[PDB]
Amino acid sequence: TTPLVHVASVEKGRSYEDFQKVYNAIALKLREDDEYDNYIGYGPVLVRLAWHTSGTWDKHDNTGGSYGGTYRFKKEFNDPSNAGLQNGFKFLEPIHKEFPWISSGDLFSLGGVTAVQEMQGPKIPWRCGRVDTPEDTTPDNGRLPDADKDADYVRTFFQRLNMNDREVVALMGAHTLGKTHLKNSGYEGPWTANPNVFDNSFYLNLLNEDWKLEKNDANNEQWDSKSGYMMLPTDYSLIQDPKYLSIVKEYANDQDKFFKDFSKAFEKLLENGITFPKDAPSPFIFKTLEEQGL
């Protein structure tokens, strides 16, 4: 079928103030529900939700992507690749109830932006305008990446999302957040010692830890360190490939550079497939609760 064009349409009469309010609601709940996942909080799962709802995009026909907010439909909601994301969706339920006017796509993506910023990460400019699309526009399962692959697979996989080497290495740095859960993906363990703090620890660990290729309780191979950290085969491929390695070293040695590059790649990821009219509002940069004294 001919590729569709998805034009961003601002929720009727809404402006920066309105979205900052939604951001605040999300941030406030992130602070309140701090016991989730052994006190890691919902930050990490919200970031993964934003990425998986956007990561289904295919640059070839513009199917998938964050625009439609199709994760709300069972086919995508039940994608094996999305196991565990139901927690993020349930967290956003009360937020959507309070602000019913925001589209699902805008909420899913904004949830990721809010989480990164509240966890001390870089500011991520965000644009509104995603519009809910019918259940038949839901992309089939299988568009998200496997974790038992190598550098070549990763590089090729991300080309479908129009991401180059630097963009891929920066985006993978999101693994500085949260952990793998055996019951969700067949992998177990955190990548870092501070799962709810967005920093460049992912890269430093990859380079400085002594990794051992072991098999977890699900009979899958993953790299483990005596410090209690782990890396998926796809994470470890970043130091096996010489081109990826150079970039990992760059980020491990420049926190600001990683922040700037992640911010750009993450916004790009969340905006793939969306056409923003020339007269659309400029991207919003939300203040954190801390900056607002809230």
- Give the residue ranges of the annotated binding site for heme b: 175
* Partners of 38 in beta bridges: none
- Which of K ion, ligand HEM, none does residue 147 bind to, with CB < 5 to 8 Å depending on kind? ligand HEM
Please choose, from the candidates 175, 282, 161, the residue with its C-alpha nearest in 3D space to the C-alpha of residue 233.
Answer: 175
Q: Is 52 one of the annotated active-site residues of the chain? A: yes
| Catalytic entry in 52, 57, 96, 211 | 52
In angstroms, the CA 106 to CA 92 distance is: 12
Select from 22, 45, 247, 270 the one that contacts ligand HEM (CB under 6 A): 45
Total chain residues near ligand HEM (CB under 6 A): 24
Q: Which residues ranging from 258 to 277 are in contact with ligand HEM (CB under 6 A)?
A: 266
Least Cβ distance, residue 78 to ligand HEM (angstroms): 15
Question: Which of 207-242 are b and which e, b meaning 16 or more Cβ less than 10 Å from the residue's Cβ?
Answer: eebebeeeebeeebebbbbeeebbbbbbbbbbbebe
| Catalytic entry in 51, 57, 126, 191 | 191
Give yes or no for residue 239 binding ligand HEM (CB under 6 A).
no
Q: Which residues ranging from 102 to 131 are in contact with ligand HEM (CB under 6 A)?
A: none
Give yes or no for residue 56 binding ligand HEM (CB under 6 A).
no
Q: Is the dihedral of CA 89, 160, 259, 242 positive or negative?
A: positive
In angstroms, the CA 148 to CA 207 distance is: 20
Kindly give the pairing relationship between strand 211-215 and strand 6-7: unpaired
Give the side-chain half-sphere CA count within 13 A for 180.
25
Two tokens, residue 53: 């709802």
- Type and span of the H or E element at 225: strand 221-225
Give yes or no for residue 180 binding ligand HEM (CB under 6 A).
yes
In angstroms, the CA 267 to CA 271 distance is: 6
Give yes or no for residue 187 binding ligand HEM (CB under 6 A).
yes
- Which of ligand HEM, K ion, none does residue 45 bind to, with CB < 5 to 8 Å depending on kind? ligand HEM
Give yes or no for residue 200 binding K ion (CB under 5 A).
no
Name the residues that contact ligand HEM, by CB under 6 A: 44-45, 47-48, 51, 84, 145, 147, 154, 171-172, 174-175, 177-181, 184-185, 187, 232, 234, 266
Cite the active site residues.
52, 191
Contact residues toward K ion (CB under 5 A) are 176, 192, 194, 197, 201
